[PDB]
C-alpha cells in the first residue's frame, strides 16, 4: 500500500530519502577513480608512488 505526503505536515512527517554507495577497494582492476591528475611514470629510481 502507498504512503502520502502533504506540505502542511510537520517535522519528521516530511519526506526523506536514502542512498547506499556500495564500494569495493580490494586489489582489482579499477573502473572509477578520483580527480587526481596523473603524473609521469618515473622509472628506475627510489620514489613514492
Amino acid at each position: 500500500q502507498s504512503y502520502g505526503f502533504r506540505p502542511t505536515y510537520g517535522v519528521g512527517h516530511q519526506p526523506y530519502r536514502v542512498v547506499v554507495l556500495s564500494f569495493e577497494l580490494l586489489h582489482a582492476p579499477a573502473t572509477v577513480c578520483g580527480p587526481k591528475k596523473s603524473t609521469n611514470l618515473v622509472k628506475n629510481k627510489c620514489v613514492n608512488f
Binding site: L26, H27, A28, P29
Partner: peptide, 18 residues
C-alpha cells in the same frame, strides 16, 4: 536421457583477481 559420471579434479577457478 540422464546418466552419471565423475569429475576427478574439475571445478577450479581463481578466487580473487590477484
Amino acid at each position: 536421457t540422464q546418466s552419471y559420471t565423475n569429475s576427478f579434479t574439475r571445478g577450479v577457478y581463481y578466487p580473487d583477481k590477484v
